[PDB]
Every structure is written in C-alpha cells, then in structure tokens.
C-alpha cells in the first residue's frame, strides 16, 4: 500500500441533510455508448424512446471522454487531476471525488455489472462495493439464453440501502455492462430486438455492416430502458429526497470506420468515434438544480465538479471547472 495523495482537504459541505432535504443521486457509469447513435444528437433512429418521454432529461451533445477504455477512463472520471494531468498508474493512491464525498458524510454505494470500479472504491469500506455480475447478487440473469446478468438488476433492493441510510445524502454508482462488444447482440433481452437483422457472430468484420449497427442500436434501447427505470426508481423517493440522475459513458466505439472495431486505442490516434460519448442529466423539479446548455463543450473532467455540486461540496481544485449543472439559481 501507499499513502493517499490529497487533492481536496479544503472541501466543505455547505448544507447538511438535517437542515434541508437529503439528496439521493444515481450516477450511471455507461459503457461503449456513442454520442452519434443517440436520437437526441441527430441519429435517425429513435434509440432513446423512453428517455424522450421523461420531463427534465437534458441531453449533452458535445461530450468527449478522457480515454478509450474502461481501466483508463473510469478512474479519471472520478479524479481531481483531470484528463491533462491524469496518470492511470497512480490514480488509485489519489484522493478521488468519492473519497471526498464519503469523508463529508455522503453514503457511497457502487454496484457493478461491468467489471469493477478500477480502483475508485479501493479506500472505502469493502461492503460499499457489490459485484452485480454475480447471479447471487443480481436477480435478473435468467431473462436471456446467455444467462447474462442485466443492468436493471442493479436496481433491485436499492430500497434496502436507502432505508439503511435513512435521511442521509446518498450517491449510488451503477456500472453498466451497456454496449460492451464485440457481442452486442448479447447485451439486450429479446424485447429490445427492434432493429433487424442482427449480427450474431463474434467476428465483427464478417457480419454485414447494417446487422452490426442493428445489434449496437438494440443494445442502446436496453440502456434507454435501464436509465428510464433508474429515473423511475429515484422518483419513488422524490418526496423524501432531492433526486437526480447523471449518465456518462466511459468511451465510445468504432463500428467499422476505416476498418476499425471496438475501442481502447491510444488517444493520440484513436478515432473520434471512440471518444464522443453521450451524457444525460435528469433531476426532479423541486431540487433547484439547473442543467448547463445542451451544447456546452464538455469532457469527463466535468463529472467530479458535478458530483460535488450535487451535494453542495466546494473544492478548490475544481473551482474553475465546467460542470454539467449551473452555478446560478432561480428563486
Ligand atoms: O485512452 C487510453 C487508452 O484506453 C489506454 O489503453 O492507452 C492510452 C489511451 O490514451
Ligand atoms: Zn468500457
């Protein structure tokens, strides 16, 4: 082990949940989703029909990931250093934004249907991380012939966590399997097999290109559903809690442009498809949180200041950063 390097020892929470409504936020950590396959960004297909029916969802049309892979992007998304000073090999020993929030009294929960938190949860109690790739944590793995555990299974029993943390601020990370490839066709249950025919081979270049896009877009429909159900879950708590949902994908995906597939390419020459990601923000009307303009130039660096602002936390290190939500409040 090594000593933790501090970045936000000045951090203070301006208000406490005994003096205003407690705050309950879900952060969906997405996977392999491309901004240009989002209906709201101009995609010809309605890949997000359920979110389109929910009042108060903001789509962000200009978000660039810090990197092109899970192990690289996820730690930077929760970092204080930002993409320009980020060092993947020492990120684990830096105070990160979850460390700050936990230290100031926010109850942190991380459920993972992807891999793990890539070091982000490592300093917090073991029980605050839960592996939802396991069929004995995730109750929703028998809805498909692959026996693949589904992201929506991470919503089961969250009410137990809320009850165990009654009246506290809470931040829940849900780490999605999402659009991970190459087997996009496995990523969604049959009710989302909307675009057809579907590539069901593992060698992507050998499928007809349209069938590859169809499988990828069907997987997006399942994520639309998962995010919508995450908002519906939050809404069952809106009387007692100020509830918000943030979604950001860890990176994009190549879909055969220039013959490139999957992701993980070094940033210097990775194509734009691997870095252009969707981001969504939803909040209940009574929270007073206001989203930034949909066309704000944004990156993964906006995540840490957003999470801090959602819990009324100020930290010098990110004082000049743009967030997904505004500093000005209408009364
Ligand atoms: O984005 C990063 C990539 O995912 C990683 O694996 O190598 C460096 C790149 O800059
Ligand atoms: Zn990923």
CSV table of C-alpha atoms and ligand atoms in Angstrom, one decimal:
chain,number,residue,atom,x,y,z
A,1,UNK,CA,0.0,0.0,0.0
A,2,UNK,CA,0.9,3.7,-0.4
A,3,UNK,CA,-0.1,6.9,1.3
A,4,UNK,CA,-3.1,8.7,-0.1
A,5,UNK,CA,-2.2,11.9,-2.1
A,6,UNK,CA,-4.7,14.6,-1.1
A,7,UNK,CA,-6.5,17.0,-3.5
A,8,UNK,CA,-9.5,18.3,-1.7
A,9,UNK,CA,-8.6,18.6,2.0
A,10,UNK,CA,-10.2,22.1,1.8
A,11,UNK,CA,-13.5,20.6,0.8
A,12,UNK,CA,-16.6,21.6,2.8
A,13,UNK,CA,-20.3,20.7,2.5
A,14,UNK,CA,-22.3,23.9,2.8
A,15,UNK,CA,-25.5,22.3,4.0
A,16,UNK,CA,-26.4,19.2,5.9
A,17,UNK,CA,-29.3,16.8,5.3
A,18,UNK,CA,-30.8,17.6,8.7
A,19,UNK,CA,-31.3,21.2,7.6
A,20,UNK,CA,-32.6,20.6,4.0
A,21,UNK,CA,-33.9,17.7,2.0
A,22,UNK,CA,-31.4,14.7,1.9
A,23,UNK,CA,-30.0,14.2,-1.6
A,24,UNK,CA,-30.2,10.9,-3.5
A,25,UNK,CA,-28.2,10.7,-6.8
A,26,UNK,CA,-27.7,7.8,-9.2
A,27,UNK,CA,-24.6,8.0,-11.4
A,28,UNK,CA,-24.9,5.5,-14.3
A,29,UNK,CA,-21.4,4.8,-15.4
A,30,UNK,CA,-22.0,3.8,-19.0
A,31,UNK,CA,-20.1,1.6,-21.4
A,32,UNK,CA,-19.2,1.8,-25.1
A,33,UNK,CA,-22.1,4.2,-26.0
A,34,UNK,CA,-21.5,6.6,-28.9
A,35,UNK,CA,-22.9,10.1,-28.9
A,36,UNK,CA,-23.7,10.0,-32.6
A,37,UNK,CA,-26.1,7.0,-32.1
A,38,UNK,CA,-28.2,9.0,-29.7
A,39,UNK,CA,-31.6,10.1,-31.2
A,40,UNK,CA,-31.2,13.5,-29.3
A,41,UNK,CA,-27.9,14.1,-31.0
A,42,UNK,CA,-29.4,13.7,-34.5
A,43,UNK,CA,-29.3,10.0,-35.1
A,44,UNK,CA,-32.1,9.0,-37.5
A,45,UNK,CA,-33.1,6.1,-35.3
A,46,UNK,CA,-35.1,6.5,-32.0
A,47,UNK,CA,-32.5,4.8,-29.8
A,48,UNK,CA,-33.8,6.5,-26.6
A,49,UNK,CA,-37.7,6.5,-26.8
A,50,UNK,CA,-38.2,6.1,-23.1
A,51,UNK,CA,-36.0,9.0,-22.0
A,52,UNK,CA,-37.7,11.1,-24.7
A,53,UNK,CA,-41.0,10.8,-22.7
A,54,UNK,CA,-39.5,11.9,-19.3
A,55,UNK,CA,-39.7,15.6,-18.4
A,56,UNK,CA,-36.4,17.1,-17.2
A,57,UNK,CA,-33.9,15.0,-19.1
A,58,UNK,CA,-31.1,17.0,-20.6
A,59,UNK,CA,-29.0,15.6,-23.4
A,60,UNK,CA,-25.5,16.9,-23.8
A,61,UNK,CA,-24.4,17.0,-27.5
A,62,UNK,CA,-20.7,17.8,-27.1
A,63,UNK,CA,-19.1,15.4,-24.5
A,64,UNK,CA,-15.6,14.0,-25.1
A,65,UNK,CA,-14.3,11.1,-22.9
A,66,UNK,CA,-10.9,11.3,-21.4
A,67,UNK,CA,-9.8,7.9,-22.9
A,68,UNK,CA,-10.9,4.9,-24.9
A,69,UNK,CA,-11.0,2.1,-22.3
A,70,UNK,CA,-12.6,1.1,-19.1
A,71,UNK,CA,-9.4,0.9,-17.0
A,72,UNK,CA,-8.2,4.2,-18.3
A,73,UNK,CA,-11.4,6.3,-18.3
A,74,UNK,CA,-13.3,5.2,-15.2
A,75,UNK,CA,-10.6,6.3,-12.7
A,76,UNK,CA,-10.2,9.7,-14.5
A,77,UNK,CA,-13.9,10.2,-14.4
A,78,UNK,CA,-13.8,10.3,-10.6
A,79,UNK,CA,-10.4,12.1,-10.4
A,80,UNK,CA,-9.3,15.5,-9.2
A,81,UNK,CA,-6.4,15.7,-11.6
A,82,UNK,CA,-8.4,15.9,-14.8
A,83,UNK,CA,-7.5,14.3,-18.1
A,84,UNK,CA,-4.5,16.5,-18.8
A,85,UNK,CA,-2.6,15.6,-15.6
A,86,UNK,CA,-4.2,12.1,-15.1
A,87,UNK,CA,-1.8,9.2,-14.6
A,88,UNK,CA,-3.6,5.9,-14.8
A,89,UNK,CA,-0.8,4.1,-12.9
A,90,UNK,CA,-1.1,6.3,-9.7
A,91,UNK,CA,-4.8,7.2,-9.8
A,92,UNK,CA,-5.5,4.5,-7.1
A,93,UNK,CA,-3.5,6.5,-4.5
A,94,UNK,CA,-5.1,9.9,-5.2
A,95,UNK,CA,-7.9,11.1,-3.2
A,96,UNK,CA,-10.9,10.9,-5.6
A,97,UNK,CA,-14.3,12.6,-5.5
A,98,UNK,CA,-15.9,9.6,-3.8
A,99,UNK,CA,-13.3,9.7,-1.1
A,100,UNK,CA,-14.2,13.3,-0.5
A,101,UNK,CA,-18.0,12.7,-0.5
A,102,UNK,CA,-17.7,9.8,1.9
A,103,UNK,CA,-15.4,11.8,4.2
A,104,UNK,CA,-18.0,14.5,4.4
A,105,UNK,CA,-20.8,12.1,5.3
A,106,UNK,CA,-22.4,11.1,1.9
A,107,UNK,CA,-23.2,7.4,1.8
A,108,UNK,CA,-21.5,5.9,-1.2
A,109,UNK,CA,-22.7,2.7,-3.0
A,110,UNK,CA,-21.1,1.1,-6.1
A,111,UNK,CA,-22.9,-1.8,-7.8
A,112,UNK,CA,-21.0,-3.2,-10.8
A,113,UNK,CA,-22.3,-5.2,-13.7
A,114,UNK,CA,-19.3,-4.5,-15.9
A,115,UNK,CA,-16.0,-5.4,-14.2
A,116,UNK,CA,-15.1,-3.4,-11.0
A,117,UNK,CA,-14.5,0.2,-10.0
A,118,UNK,CA,-11.0,0.2,-11.5
A,119,UNK,CA,-9.5,1.3,-8.1
A,120,UNK,CA,-12.0,4.1,-7.4
A,121,UNK,CA,-13.7,2.4,-4.5
A,122,UNK,CA,-10.5,0.9,-3.0
A,123,UNK,CA,-10.2,3.2,0.0
A,124,UNK,CA,-13.8,2.9,1.1
A,125,UNK,CA,-15.3,0.0,3.1
A,126,UNK,CA,-15.4,-3.3,1.2
A,127,UNK,CA,-19.2,-3.5,1.7
A,128,UNK,CA,-19.8,-0.4,-0.3
A,129,UNK,CA,-18.8,-2.2,-3.5
A,130,UNK,CA,-21.0,-5.0,-4.8
A,131,UNK,CA,-20.4,-7.3,-7.8
A,132,UNK,CA,-23.6,-7.4,-9.8
A,133,UNK,CA,-22.1,-9.7,-12.4
A,134,UNK,CA,-22.9,-12.5,-9.9
A,135,UNK,CA,-26.2,-14.3,-10.2
A,136,UNK,CA,-26.5,-14.3,-6.4
A,137,UNK,CA,-26.4,-10.6,-6.2
A,138,UNK,CA,-28.2,-9.9,-9.5
A,139,UNK,CA,-31.7,-11.3,-9.7
A,140,UNK,CA,-32.0,-10.6,-13.4
A,141,UNK,CA,-29.7,-13.0,-15.2
A,142,UNK,CA,-32.2,-15.6,-16.5
A,143,UNK,CA,-34.1,-13.4,-18.9
A,144,UNK,CA,-31.9,-14.3,-21.9
A,145,UNK,CA,-30.4,-17.6,-23.2
A,146,UNK,CA,-26.9,-16.4,-22.4
A,147,UNK,CA,-27.6,-16.3,-18.7
A,148,UNK,CA,-26.2,-12.7,-18.8
A,149,UNK,CA,-26.9,-10.5,-15.8
A,150,UNK,CA,-28.7,-7.3,-16.8
A,151,UNK,CA,-28.0,-3.8,-15.7
A,152,UNK,CA,-31.6,-3.3,-14.5
A,153,UNK,CA,-30.8,-6.0,-11.9
A,154,UNK,CA,-28.8,-3.4,-10.1
A,155,UNK,CA,-32.0,-1.6,-9.1
A,156,UNK,CA,-33.3,-4.5,-7.1
A,157,UNK,CA,-33.1,-3.8,-3.4
A,158,UNK,CA,-31.7,-0.3,-3.6
A,159,UNK,CA,-34.6,0.5,-1.2
A,160,UNK,CA,-32.8,-1.6,1.5
A,161,UNK,CA,-29.7,0.7,1.1
A,162,UNK,CA,-31.9,3.8,1.3
A,163,UNK,CA,-33.7,2.5,4.4
A,164,UNK,CA,-30.3,1.7,6.0
A,165,UNK,CA,-29.2,5.2,5.2
A,166,UNK,CA,-32.4,6.9,6.0
A,167,UNK,CA,-32.2,10.7,5.9
A,168,UNK,CA,-28.5,10.8,4.7
A,169,UNK,CA,-27.1,12.1,1.5
A,170,UNK,CA,-26.5,9.2,-0.9
A,171,UNK,CA,-24.6,8.7,-4.1
A,172,UNK,CA,-25.1,5.4,-5.9
A,173,UNK,CA,-22.9,4.4,-8.9
A,174,UNK,CA,-24.3,1.8,-11.2
A,175,UNK,CA,-21.6,0.5,-13.5
A,176,UNK,CA,-23.2,-0.7,-16.7
A,177,UNK,CA,-22.4,-3.6,-19.0
A,178,UNK,CA,-24.2,-1.4,-21.5
A,179,UNK,CA,-23.0,-1.6,-25.1
A,180,UNK,CA,-19.8,-3.6,-24.5
A,181,UNK,CA,-18.7,-5.6,-27.5
A,182,UNK,CA,-17.9,-7.5,-29.6
A,183,UNK,CA,-21.1,-9.4,-28.8
A,184,UNK,CA,-23.6,-6.5,-28.9
A,185,UNK,CA,-26.4,-9.0,-29.6
A,186,UNK,CA,-26.0,-10.5,-26.1
A,187,UNK,CA,-26.3,-7.1,-24.4
A,188,UNK,CA,-30.1,-6.9,-24.5
A,189,UNK,CA,-33.2,-9.1,-23.9
A,190,UNK,CA,-35.4,-10.0,-26.8
A,191,UNK,CA,-38.0,-7.3,-26.1
A,192,UNK,CA,-35.3,-4.8,-27.4
A,193,UNK,CA,-34.6,-6.7,-30.7
A,194,UNK,CA,-36.2,-3.9,-32.6
A,195,UNK,CA,-33.7,-3.4,-35.4
A,196,UNK,CA,-33.3,-6.4,-37.5
A,197,UNK,CA,-31.5,-8.4,-38.9
A,198,UNK,CA,-28.8,-8.7,-36.2
A,199,UNK,CA,-25.1,-9.7,-36.3
A,200,UNK,CA,-24.8,-12.7,-34.0
A,201,UNK,CA,-21.2,-13.7,-34.9
A,202,UNK,CA,-18.2,-12.7,-32.8
A,203,UNK,CA,-16.0,-11.7,-35.7
A,204,UNK,CA,-17.4,-8.2,-36.4
A,205,UNK,CA,-15.9,-7.6,-39.9
A,206,UNK,CA,-17.6,-10.8,-41.2
A,207,UNK,CA,-21.1,-9.6,-40.4
A,208,UNK,CA,-23.0,-7.4,-42.8
A,209,UNK,CA,-22.4,-3.8,-41.6
A,210,UNK,CA,-26.1,-3.0,-41.2
A,211,UNK,CA,-26.6,-6.0,-39.0
A,212,UNK,CA,-23.8,-4.9,-36.8
A,213,UNK,CA,-25.3,-1.4,-36.4
A,214,UNK,CA,-28.7,-3.0,-35.6
A,215,UNK,CA,-27.3,-5.1,-32.8
A,216,UNK,CA,-25.5,-2.0,-31.4
A,217,UNK,CA,-28.7,0.1,-31.6
A,218,UNK,CA,-30.7,-2.6,-29.9
A,219,UNK,CA,-28.2,-2.6,-27.0
A,220,UNK,CA,-28.8,1.2,-26.8
A,221,UNK,CA,-32.5,0.6,-26.4
A,222,UNK,CA,-31.8,-1.6,-23.4
A,223,UNK,CA,-29.7,1.2,-21.9
A,224,UNK,CA,-32.5,3.7,-22.6
A,225,UNK,CA,-34.8,1.3,-20.6
A,226,UNK,CA,-32.2,0.9,-17.8
A,227,UNK,CA,-31.8,4.7,-17.4
A,228,UNK,CA,-35.5,5.3,-17.6
A,229,UNK,CA,-36.1,2.7,-14.9
A,230,UNK,CA,-33.3,4.2,-12.8
A,231,UNK,CA,-35.2,7.6,-13.0
A,232,UNK,CA,-38.5,5.8,-12.1
A,233,UNK,CA,-36.8,4.3,-9.1
A,234,UNK,CA,-35.5,7.7,-8.0
A,235,UNK,CA,-39.0,9.1,-8.4
A,236,UNK,CA,-40.3,6.7,-5.8
A,237,UNK,CA,-38.2,8.7,-3.3
A,238,UNK,CA,-38.8,12.2,-4.5
A,239,UNK,CA,-41.0,13.2,-1.6
A,240,UNK,CA,-38.3,12.5,1.0
A,241,UNK,CA,-35.2,13.1,-1.2
A,242,UNK,CA,-34.0,15.6,-3.8
A,243,UNK,CA,-33.3,13.1,-6.6
A,244,UNK,CA,-31.1,13.4,-9.7
A,245,UNK,CA,-29.6,11.0,-12.3
A,246,UNK,CA,-26.3,11.5,-14.2
A,247,UNK,CA,-25.3,9.3,-17.1
A,248,UNK,CA,-21.9,9.4,-18.8
A,249,UNK,CA,-20.3,6.7,-21.0
A,250,UNK,CA,-16.7,5.7,-20.3
A,251,UNK,CA,-15.8,5.9,-24.1
A,252,UNK,CA,-17.3,5.4,-27.5
A,253,UNK,CA,-16.9,2.6,-30.0
A,254,UNK,CA,-15.5,2.1,-33.5
A,255,UNK,CA,-18.1,0.4,-35.8
A,256,UNK,CA,-16.0,-0.4,-38.9
A,257,UNK,CA,-15.0,3.1,-39.9
A,258,UNK,CA,-11.6,2.7,-41.7
A,259,UNK,CA,-11.9,-1.0,-40.8
A,260,UNK,CA,-11.6,-0.2,-37.0
A,261,UNK,CA,-13.7,-2.1,-34.4
A,262,UNK,CA,-14.1,-2.0,-30.6
A,263,UNK,CA,-12.1,0.6,-28.7
A,264,UNK,CA,-9.1,1.0,-26.4
A,265,UNK,CA,-6.9,2.8,-28.9
A,266,UNK,CA,-4.3,5.2,-27.6
A,267,UNK,CA,-5.7,8.7,-27.5
A,268,UNK,CA,-3.1,10.2,-29.8
A,269,UNK,CA,-4.5,8.3,-32.8
A,270,UNK,CA,-7.9,6.9,-31.6
A,271,UNK,CA,-10.7,7.9,-34.0
A,272,UNK,CA,-13.2,10.4,-32.8
A,273,UNK,CA,-15.8,7.6,-32.6
A,274,UNK,CA,-14.0,6.2,-29.5
A,275,UNK,CA,-14.2,9.5,-27.6
A,276,UNK,CA,-17.6,11.1,-28.4
A,277,UNK,CA,-19.9,9.9,-25.7
A,278,UNK,CA,-23.5,10.7,-24.6
A,279,UNK,CA,-24.3,12.3,-21.3
A,280,UNK,CA,-27.7,12.7,-19.8
A,281,UNK,CA,-28.8,14.6,-16.7
A,282,UNK,CA,-32.2,14.3,-15.0
A,283,UNK,CA,-33.5,15.9,-11.9
A,284,UNK,CA,-36.7,16.3,-10.1
A,285,UNK,CA,-38.3,19.8,-10.4
A,286,UNK,CA,-38.0,20.6,-6.7
A,287,UNK,CA,-34.2,20.1,-6.4
A,288,UNK,CA,-33.3,23.6,-7.7
A,289,UNK,CA,-30.6,22.0,-9.9
A,290,UNK,CA,-30.3,23.6,-13.3
A,291,UNK,CA,-28.5,21.9,-16.3
A,292,UNK,CA,-25.9,23.6,-18.4
A,293,UNK,CA,-26.7,24.4,-22.0
A,294,UNK,CA,-27.0,21.2,-24.1
A,295,UNK,CA,-24.3,22.3,-26.4
A,296,UNK,CA,-21.7,23.1,-23.7
A,297,UNK,CA,-18.3,21.8,-24.7
A,298,UNK,CA,-17.9,19.1,-22.0
A,299,UNK,CA,-15.5,16.3,-21.1
A,300,UNK,CA,-15.1,13.7,-18.4
A,301,UNK,CA,-13.5,16.5,-16.3
A,302,UNK,CA,-17.0,17.8,-15.7
A,303,UNK,CA,-18.0,14.8,-13.7
A,304,UNK,CA,-16.1,15.5,-10.5
A,305,UNK,CA,-17.4,19.1,-10.1
A,306,UNK,CA,-20.9,17.9,-11.0
A,307,UNK,CA,-20.9,15.3,-8.2
A,308,UNK,CA,-19.5,17.8,-5.7
A,309,UNK,CA,-22.1,20.4,-6.7
A,310,UNK,CA,-25.0,17.9,-6.4
A,311,UNK,CA,-24.0,17.5,-2.7
A,312,UNK,CA,-23.2,21.2,-2.0
A,313,UNK,CA,-19.5,20.5,-1.7
A,314,UNK,CA,-16.9,23.1,-2.6
A,315,UNK,CA,-13.3,22.1,-3.5
A,316,UNK,CA,-10.6,24.5,-4.6
A,317,UNK,CA,-9.0,22.0,-7.0
A,318,UNK,CA,-12.0,22.2,-9.4
A,319,UNK,CA,-13.2,25.7,-8.7
A,320,UNK,CA,-12.7,26.8,-12.4
A,321,UNK,CA,-14.1,23.6,-14.0
A,322,UNK,CA,-17.2,23.5,-16.1
A,323,UNK,CA,-19.8,21.1,-14.8
A,324,UNK,CA,-23.0,19.6,-16.2
A,325,UNK,CA,-25.0,21.9,-13.9
A,326,UNK,CA,-25.1,25.6,-13.4
A,327,UNK,CA,-23.8,27.8,-10.5
A,328,UNK,CA,-26.8,30.3,-10.7
A,329,UNK,CA,-30.1,29.5,-9.0
A,330,UNK,CA,-33.5,31.0,-9.8
A,331,UNK,CA,-35.7,31.6,-6.7
B,1,LIG,O1,-7.4,6.3,-23.9
B,1,LIG,C1,-6.2,5.5,-23.5
B,1,LIG,C2,-6.4,4.0,-23.8
B,1,LIG,O2,-7.7,3.5,-23.5
B,1,LIG,C3,-5.3,3.3,-23.0
B,1,LIG,O3,-5.4,1.9,-23.1
B,1,LIG,O4,-3.9,3.7,-23.5
B,1,LIG,C4,-3.8,5.2,-23.5
B,1,LIG,C5,-5.0,5.9,-24.2
B,1,LIG,O5,-4.8,7.3,-24.2
B,2,LIG,ZN1,-15.6,0.5,-21.4
